[PDB]
């Protein structure tokens, strides 16, 4: 706010305006990034008063009405992340609005599965949604219903480990905390550069105007103008490149929102390790957290196997699953869970005589 | 004779309050763990400036002289405690080559269980004094701990200095270097710890 | 807005046109209590005085020289100054000042000037052509003149050569005034080099005695031990002001504060070097400094082809510092706050948006996220679609920029 | 005097080329997305939820536009639901049947 | 390696320090990029004899 300096800054023309235009382009994009992750749901779906989700317990991830109206795990995440012409603008969506979108996405997912992404939300019982998520990974739905208490207890236990993982240490949130740190470090660096001389007699602008007369002071001030303007161009270039890194992360987060919250991804290791069942979005400062629920197969046995079995000269192949021998009998099992079925013309289909197939075995096929 | 200085000899480098914060600054400081000179007086070089410290609960030491000749041909600082307070003069003193006290002039001014520590430095035309007083439990070496020295006076005398001597049981002398230091300011703006950045790779 | 966009038509949006900044209500100056006023009484008011052949110099240093005490003293028979106007003296600073003092007759006071000639000028006290400093005199016939004549005062009548500028020579050696060799004793044309004015009370205005003082100034590598007195104003808290404390010039709002500076500390700094507190030099309170209130000014507008009404957002400002409404984004002016919620038309921030709506005005509202829906969940109900719609969705993606190439030589140096 | 013009005009041109390099990377990310939407949505049938527009993807058609591409994503949207009572399995002669 | 030039360069403040910081950030990211591709396998599997 020196008027002597302002008259010299006008000689540099459009440099000052295009720094404000560049930072405004970044600032508006941060709301576009936040909108396109969370605002994927057209209606604010809300959970019923009852909580009979087949024994699954979402109480740590659904909203807490006693709390902003964040979930328990969203409150952990919001606790663990922590004027020389510079200003900071508010986001377009408050944390209370972001928590209404994660609540709507979660309440839709729980009460209606993949269906609320594709059209109107269609209700389905949670144990039947999980059966259709099990069929999606090639495990036959009776493997859910016959194990529903075990699967519910394993899910409830695994959400319990998320509370401990986020309560006992902050160190998991390093990706979000580093985004706060890089912006604080960049703003402090931009302000610290006001103390630098850039070769001028002093860095204090009124000090130059006391020590020297107009023509000499103008030569000393033009060093401060050159250095401070080069320090803004350095900061705004650095924020343009850092905004491209955050936009690439926001496009990835918008894609995990669409393909894993609103659906069930078939893409290997995209939405957690193991075969993907579903995921739940939880908000965090400057980011999003997905709790990816996945099936991991856990207790293998070795079996002898054959590509086909030869019956009355005909080679039989399994429709779904694979042949295995327990040691002396032969069975067909689904691929991803040991459930042995007796080999029948329902389980198997024919293709030609034995002699074409390398490694075919002689065993009986039952005809009902 | 010589001694390890430990972490002694930090002072407030400017009249600025800072709090709850770490400040990185370059100034004439005594290096940490420097191997400083020790005495029970000789004329000494002044270099960039001096840290001077004494086991003073005794009034053996009375004052100092600073200049180039320390004799007649040019003006020199004389500093003496008159047993009430410090007196300062800058006269062309022709005084004794072995000065002692019982166990023209262009400027003038008037202000064992203990250590009294002082820093003397000259910049562009001002002579600056910083000091501190503390209890101690050791007779031989400097007390191994930390406490910063506070400014007393900042004198507009314009004199050139290259040598000094004491007027007058242990006391110690060490020379400032243009070190970079990191300074820990507490809630009341006292320096409560420091790192000599050039000391070792962890300090860097 | 039209000027900030450099165009005559403005389309719908929010445009940052300008920056609001509270102006300083007044300018304030603070310095320590004015002390060590220079010892001019020892030269201007002392009872004793010097003979002009052997003048007395007082060295002036380490003090504030209020020259207005001298030049406003209407009792003085003359004031003159060289290289400086009297009203400018109290702004200046010097390494040393010298006050040179003597008694002379009134008719020789006119000799006391740069480069002039006469008995005093050439043989008692010589001033250079480039003398910078002041000449001051007053009649002293009350002290320096006596019945029968005061013969105690003397001036040099004879010398072999003129004095150089500020040369001092008190010697009484007998002077050869002609062909007579002196041989260490007086005689015809071998004379005592001094004479007396003999000041009698019957003397006229030009023969009466005057006490004279000449002030000489210098600036060197040693710092300025003399300055004219520093002014100061009253202190204003809670208003926006421009301020100086000693040499710490700035603009801000001043308040009392909970900060406890150590006794020697004068200023306080924030994490990023920015000054945020000061000690007042006349009563040692610690004042917080905060910047005078500022923020981006944004014009919210419908398209100018539809309406010329506008609303203004003062980003981060609180309205008491500028319909009117305090949003979390800042003071919003010229927009009706509305109790409904709608899809976001023009965004403002912190959940607020604005639009031009019904007879029409700019409204501002908390944006609506979407229609609330209770999914009809129960543990044995399923909804199955009985029918479908084929939907066609248009998606647009950019694929390439306009290819440009610049001749760097022709752009820089046509 | 000319060194002031050369310094200002060269820094003016470096500021433009720096922004064009960053803007070209933004458009490359969109050209790689459009290349992927053509391979997966047009040349195939993507099962990736909301990748090829809202609803279940049937097919899409490219149309050119100046500096871009436009996809007409044809999707099946379910539209007139009815509530039914449901069960995970049914118990017949003491055995559980699943659909 | 001029002493006289280095004491001029310090008067530009954080420009030289933030160039070293920027290139160090690029250097560490090359190790991250190379881990994200190849280090997806949890164990060093070996083929049979
Ligand atoms: C769900 O789990 C929480 C503890 O994690 C427990 O307090 C609650 O009673 C459980 N049941 C329901 C229906 O919330
Ligand atoms: C399968 O058999 C091999 C025989 O070498 C053995 O090493 C392996 O541990 C067995 N795996 C299991 C799960 O029993
Ligand atoms: C294999 O399955 C049959 C099923 O009746 C069982 O009797 C037999 O004990 C199993 N084990 C072996 C080693 O054959
Ligand atoms: C496996 O290899 C052995 C090698 O001796 C061979 O006897 C056997 O027929 C092969 N079986 C299949 C299924 O390829
Ligand atoms: C399988 O059965 C056929 C007909 O009985 C016989 O010729 C053949 O040798 C048997 N064994 C194998 C391994 O093909
Ligand atoms: C300390 O320094 C002196 C020379 O300044 C040297 O004679 C002495 O040996 C040194 N002592 C140690 C322990 O390094
Ligand atoms: C600061 O000074 C106050 C004086 O009342 C004292 O209470 C406090 O303990 C001191 N120390 C700190 C670190 O604030
Ligand atoms: C300054 O002078 C005034 C008036 O004599 C007095 O009230 C005040 O205490 C003085 N302050 C200092 C710091 O000397
Ligand atoms: C302005 O509004 C009129 C309404 O009839 C319309 O014809 C015209 O296209 C509009 N032009 C612009 C620049 O909005
Ligand atoms: C705005 O300023 C007034 C004082 O002018 C203050 O009382 C108020 O708390 C401030 N904040 C808001 C949101 O009004
Ligand atoms: C909105 O309605 C509430 C309750 O009637 C009232 O307190 C508030 O002032 C209203 N605001 C506006 C702008 O109508
Ligand atoms: C299905 O919807 C279409 C309109 O989209 C309607 O014409 C048709 O009659 C409906 N058919 C049934 C079976 O409801
Ligand atoms: C389904 O049941 C709910 C609750 O009884 C009801 O609100 C809704 O209108 C019903 N019909 C459809 C098609 O959802």
Numbering used by the authors:
A (entry chain C): 745 to 811, 813 to 827, 855 to 1140
B (entry chain C): 27 to 66, 81 to 143, 165 to 172, 186 to 242, 263 to 298
C (entry chain B): 299 to 620, 641 to 676, 689 to 744
D (entry chain B): 992 to 1090
E (entry chain A): 745 to 793
The authors write:
Three RBD substitutions—Lys417 → Asn (K417N), Glu484 → Lys (E484K), and Asn501 → Tyr (N501Y)—occurred in the B.1.1.28 and the B.1.351 lineages that originated in Brazil and South Africa, respectively. Of these, the E484K mutation is of particular concern because of its location within nAb epitopes, and it has been shown to reduce or eliminate binding to many potent RBD-directed nAbs. Despite no additional RBD mutations, binding to RBD-directed nAbs was further reduced, showing that amino acid changes outside the RBD have an allosteric effect on the binding of RBD-directed Abs. A cryo-EM dataset of a B.1.351 spike revealed a ~6:1 ratio of RBD-up to 3-RBD-down structures. Taken together, these data implicate the K417N-E484K-N501Y substitutions in the RBD disorder observed in the 3-RBD-down states and suggest that the E484K-induced conformational disorder in the RBD tip Hook structure may be the source of the increased RBD-up spike populations due to weakened RBD-to-RBD coupling. In the spike, interprotomer interactions made by the RBD in its up state, and secondary contacts that the bound antibody makes with adjacent RBDs, may play a role in stabilizing antibody binding to the E484K mutant, thereby explaining the retention of high-affinity binding, albeit at lower levels. For the triple mutant and B.1.351 spike structures, the RBD tip disorder presumably reduces the stability of its contact with the adjacent RBD, increasing its up-state propensity. In the B.1.1.7 variant, this occurred by modifications in the interaction between SD1 or SD2 and S2, whereas for variants harboring the K417N/E484K/N501Y RBD triple substitutions, RBD destabilization was mediated by RBD-RBD contacts.
Changes in the spike (S) glycoprotein in these variants are under scrutiny because the S protein has a central role in engaging the angiotensin-converting enzyme 2 (ACE2) receptor to mediate cellular entry and is a dominant target of neutralizing antibodies (nAbs) elicited by either vaccination or natural infection. The prefusion SARS-CoV-2 S trimer is composed of S1 and S2 subunits separated by a furin cleavage site. The S1 subunit contains the N-terminal domain (NTD), ACE2 receptor binding domain (RBD), and two subdomains (SD1 and SD2). The RBD transitions between a “closed” (“down”) receptor-inaccessible conformation and an “open” (“up”) conformation that allows binding to the ACE2 receptor.
